[PDB]
Design a protein that fits this description.
The structure is cut from a larger assembly and holds chains A (84 residues), B (177 residues), C (50 residues), D (136 residues), E (149 residues) and F (188 residues). Chain A has 84 residues and is an all-beta fold. Chain A has no helices and eight strands. Chain A is elongated, with a radius of gyration of 21 Å. Chain B has a five-stranded antiparallel β-sheet with strand order 2-3-1-5-4. Chain B starts with a helix and ends in an 8-residue tail after the last helix. The chains are: A mainly beta (84), B alpha+beta (177), C mainly beta (50), D alpha+beta (136), E mainly alpha (149), F mainly beta (188). The structure holds four RNA strands. Chain A: Part of the 50S ribosomal subunit. Cross-links to the 23S rRNA. Cross-links to the A and P site tRNAs.
RNA sequence: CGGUGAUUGGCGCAGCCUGGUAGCGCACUUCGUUCGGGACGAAGGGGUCGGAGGUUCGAAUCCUCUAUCACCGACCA
RNA sequence: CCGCCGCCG
RNA sequence: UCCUCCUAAAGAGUAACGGAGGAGCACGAAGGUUGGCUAAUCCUGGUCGGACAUCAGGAGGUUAGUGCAAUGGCAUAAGCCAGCUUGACUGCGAGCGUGACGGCGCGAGCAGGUGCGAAAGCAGGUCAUAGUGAUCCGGUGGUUCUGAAUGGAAGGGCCAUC
RNA sequence: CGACUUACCAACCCGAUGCAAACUGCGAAUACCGGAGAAUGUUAUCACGGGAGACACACGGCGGGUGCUAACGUCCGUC
């Protein structure tokens, strides 16, 4: 049986997936220091009692419930904590 | 300061009746006079610009600000942030003094003089002329210069049209070719 | 590859040292930064070495 | 063959042909050719149905083409095993949903247009039908 | 540019451009050291070619002859910097200071010329680093020193 | 530290083996049925440097260092050793008589010559295509009989010798070529 | 079928590696030399890199797509 | 030293 | 091997010799902080001056820029400039995120010690994700921590690090 | 130094018409995470400790890559 030659493929490279996204959802009681949202850019901005790490990682700065807002003139999403 | 007091009560009364203004803040006054020197050929030496920047120290009464390049093109072999020109912006007290020295003892010294074109308006009322020598200004000693390249003078006013600003310069007699 | 490493020797009596990278073929002079010392607990100016 | 110029990428996925069409009504011309069967039309099939239709409307008039392929189809060469990458671009198809008007025409009688789309429907793999430009 | 008027505050007399290349063509020995900066390196490298270096006037990134720090070059280099030149043999003669200076400091200046010459261990040295080190005054004294102490 | 198997270096990629470091000029690739592939790599010597011919198989690799070739500027002569000069970083360099052999006559001053830089400092010096030179030891050439082409020998100021035509006798600067070493024209 | 390195002035070849410049040898044009021609001397012209698209301040160079033409050849049954 | 030939009646 | 997007089916994860691109760095300013600023490209007018130098005005709207691919992101600007500087600092770190694990990533705040700002405050690198490899062995510096009878040192240990 | 004539191609806009995994000014159904309550289920939950097996899967429905919208083909998700 005859067998012709076969080409090559330049593609075939992908990364380890970084597990980005929302970790704690809304109305969920968290401890202080818990990561809420891992994200590349600030899809979600930091609201009240929520900080912003160097990785744009929104982390909780107090205990209480995760709250999502649509605040601001630029209609952007903030994340706050009502202190419980 | 001579033709600044001439503007206050002779030129305003000339202009309040020709275009039916209803307030004294409606008349256009000249805001600034900007002197660019687009040297251009400073790609060879830096001291050609320093000779050219010293040429504005005699025409104006202050030091020019050199301008870095905005973009970088291929037709002129320039780069980003290069001193391709130097500018003089003069306003306040000496802008009446430079306009005193221009139209009286610098404009009639232009070689092959016929007059100034009234087509040099952008529709806003900001006149811009172009001079072609350094030897029309009395401060240049005719020996320190080594280039025919001159400069341009932009007279920026606070008008809205060309006819609104043509009668503004008409009181200073502005030779009007 | 190009950017080699240096050793910031403390000019005080201690033997503590920071290390960092400096491109020698661009700015060939030494670094005289001023950081914290965990031994003397002073703010001693550090000097460049190998 | 109606072929695009400097596309975004050379090759794309296969893609399903679900959903209905969007170009339901005839807008420009007086009469149209509405498709009923769910298939696809290669870039030769639009140009072959235009040669057998521009003649029978004798050349004065105006003919529209309401579709454009802009979808590459790959094809492996002769006697090539599976795998080893994606094939080469050969032709361009248009995913024709049911309810899509293919051609339009203005400046012809109804008898001449009826014997024109009949001479172009046989050049197409999909089942088409004759319609009329409805008001509003 | 501005460094032609900012290096004058460091103590240099004749600061400029290719007008100083006419002084090179005349062979003026009023200058001994040449210091430039990497924008007028097209002057010495194209006009002072032969006369600059059996002239031996230096313009190196090997040495610190041409930095872009031309304001703060000659605040100490015009004062106290003595330049190390090569010879065909083993010898590297330098210059000591005025006789009536602090002689305790000069013996540490000779001791801190050891750390400068051992700062480059060219890494292809032979048996010794320093064999004979003698500091003479001008033409009379002979003082044999040691390489270790 | 780099690695280059026989499917990698193809043209203008230096290799290092024992040494001296060589250079690939041109090569072919044969992938024959039953057996291992090879490559008729026509190498080029760099130091002496005439030629070497090897037929590398699929194994093995070779160290690639150094590659660096760049424009220099000759300006200095003293005893034996020579020097050059950069225009992109302005760094000094030292040359030897080993790097100048059968080339030291043509380059005179401020020439745009190139060298090959490898581990301190050169390997060889390549003179430019055209240099201007002057004859000082040349007879006052008569016309003669002469019935044809010729053409008198001229001893050059650098110690070389070229064949010049009749109209240049004493102190006439001329430009020639350095590939073959013949007269082409006179600068005016 | 695959893979790899080329195409640069009429022609043959550089330069690419490591980006700011397009050459060299003939051929060709004019003059001198000869009674004239060839050859030899003097002066000079000639293309802007197969085509297209990227990268970049800037591309003959660095990448990609086809077009064209050579060399490696279609292995175990 | 070098210096080739000069269309066919 | 690592990074961006799609395939991946609206949390995450998800394969193929599936479609596409990049990385094996750079920087002592391009970091920290304070203060100030807002583009691209066309249009008009204007010495040399032209499709494109700089100047003046408007339309226009972030289609610009971000040391470097790609998505996400940013006007309070992370985009640009300047003054002053080294927080690119030591010992920790409640907590969780992600991995079979080795590991990786975020971290309020405390203690000591600085920087800038009048002050509130911010800074344990750079807008973020690529710029990197486990151990063994071996080398340099420090620290009586051990040190084969004792007193030392050698060699080991800890820490910084090649 | 002045250019007029001008069956021919054509940008930015206006109006209409389509297309797209690597387009998004809109946007479900399900799935997913978090709380409360009712009924039900042999704690089906999680944390440890002992001992394994297994890491060649296959077919069909749905959603796809690839292949010729070929295969009882191949590669994933979910049942």
């Amino acid at each position: 049986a005859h067998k012709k030659g076969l080409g090559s493929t330049r593609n075939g490279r992908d990364s380890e997936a970084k597990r980005l996204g929302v970790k704690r959802f809304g109305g969920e009681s968290v401890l202080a220091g818990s990561i809420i949202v891992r994200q590349r850019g600030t899809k979600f901005h930091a609201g009240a009692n929520v900080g912003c790490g160097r990785d744009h990682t929104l982390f909780a700065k107090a205990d209480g419930k995760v709250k999502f807002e649509v605040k601001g003139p630029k209609n952007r999403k903030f994340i706050s904590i009502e202190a419980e | 300061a001579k033709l600044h007091d001439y503007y206050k009560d002779e030129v305003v009364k000339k202009l309040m009746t020709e275009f039916n203004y209803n307030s004294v803040m409606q008349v256009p006054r000249v805001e600034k006079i900007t002197l660019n020197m687009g040297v251009g050929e400073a790609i060879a030496d830096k001291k050609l610009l320093d000779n050219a920047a010293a040429d504005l120290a005699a025409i104006s009464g202050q030091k020019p600000l050199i301008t870095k390049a905005r973009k970088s093109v291929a037709g002129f072999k320039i780069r980003q942030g290069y001193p391709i020109g130097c500018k003089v912006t003069l306003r306040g007290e000496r802008m009446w003094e430079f306009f005193e020295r221009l139209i009286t003892i610098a404009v009639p010294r232009i070689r092959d003089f016929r007059g100034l074109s009234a087509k040099s308006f952008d529709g806003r009322g900001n006149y811009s002329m172009g001079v072609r020598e350094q030897i029309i200004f009395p401060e240049i000693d005719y020996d320190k210069v080594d280039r025919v390249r001159g400069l341009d003078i932009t007279i920026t006013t606070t008008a809205k049209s060309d006819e609104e600003g043509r009668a503004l310069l008409a009181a200073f007699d502005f030779p009007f070719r | 590859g190009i950017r080699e490493k240096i050793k910031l020797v403390s000019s005080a009596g201690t033997g503590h040292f920071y290390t960092t990278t400096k491109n020698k073929r661009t700015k060939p002079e030494k670094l005289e930064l001023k950081k914290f010392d965990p031994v003397v607990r002073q703010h001693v100016i550090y000097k460049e070495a190998k | 063959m109606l072929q695009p110029k400097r596309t975004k990428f050379r090759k794309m996925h296969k893609g399903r042909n679900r959903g209905l069409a969007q170009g339901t009504d005839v807008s420009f011309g007086s009469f149209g050719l509405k498709a009923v069967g769910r298939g696809r039309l290669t870039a030769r099939q639009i140009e072959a149905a235009r040669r057998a239709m521009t003649r029978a409307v004798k050349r004065q008039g105006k003919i529209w083409i309401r579709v454009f392929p802009d979808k590459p189809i790959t094809e492996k060469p002769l006697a090539v095993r599976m795998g080893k990458g994606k094939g080469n671009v050969e032709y361009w198809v248009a995913l024709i949903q049911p309810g899509k008007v293919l051609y339009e025409m203005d400046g012809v009688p109804e008898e001449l247009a009826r014997e024109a789309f009949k001479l172009a429907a046989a050049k197409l793999p999909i089942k088409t039908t004759f319609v009329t430009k409805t008001v509003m | 540019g501005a460094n032609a008027e900012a290096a004058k505050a460091a103590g240099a007399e004749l600061v400029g451009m290719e007008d100083l290349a006419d002084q090179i063509k005349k062979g003026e020995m009023n200058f001994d050291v040449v210091i430039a900066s990497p924008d007028a390196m097209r002057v010495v490298g194209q006009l002072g070619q032969v006369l600059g270096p059996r002239g031996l006037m230096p313009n190196p990134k090997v040495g610190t002859v041409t930095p872009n720090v031309a304001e703060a070059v000659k605040n100490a280099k015009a004062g106290q910097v003595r330049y190390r030149n090569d010879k065909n043999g083993i010898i590297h003669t330098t210059i000591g200071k005025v006789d009536f200076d602090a002689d305790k400091l000069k013996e540490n200046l000779e001791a801190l010329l050891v750390a400068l010459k051992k700062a480059k261990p060219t890494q292809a040295k032979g048996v010794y680093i320093k064999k004979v080190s003698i500091s003479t005054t001008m033409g009379a004294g002979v003082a044999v020193d040691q390489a270790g102490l | 530290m780099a690695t280059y198997y026989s499917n990698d270096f193809r043209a203008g990629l230096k290799i290092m083996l024992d040494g001296e470091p060589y250079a690939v000029e041109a090569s072919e690739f044969v992938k024959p049925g039953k057996g291992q592939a090879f490559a008729r790599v026509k190498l080029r010597r760099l130091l002496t440097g005439t030629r070497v011919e090897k037929t590398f198989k699929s194994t093995d690799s070779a160290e690639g260092a150094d590659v660096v070739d760049m424009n220099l500027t000759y300006l200095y002569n003293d005893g034996e050793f020579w020097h050059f000069m950069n225009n992109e970083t302005f760094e000094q360099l030292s040359a030897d008589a080993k790097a100048i052999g059968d080339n030291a006559k043509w380059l005179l001053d401020q020439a745009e010559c190139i060298v090959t830089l490898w581990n301190g400092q050169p390997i060889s010096v390549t003179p430019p295509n055209f240099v201007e030179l002057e004859i000082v030891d040349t007879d006052p050439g008569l016309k003669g009989d002469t019935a044809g082409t010729g053409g008198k020998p001229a001893t050059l100021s650098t110690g070389a010798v070229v064949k010049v035509p009749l109209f240049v006798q004493i102190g006439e600067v001329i430009k020639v070529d350095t590939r073959s070493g013949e007269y082409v024209s006179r600068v005016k």
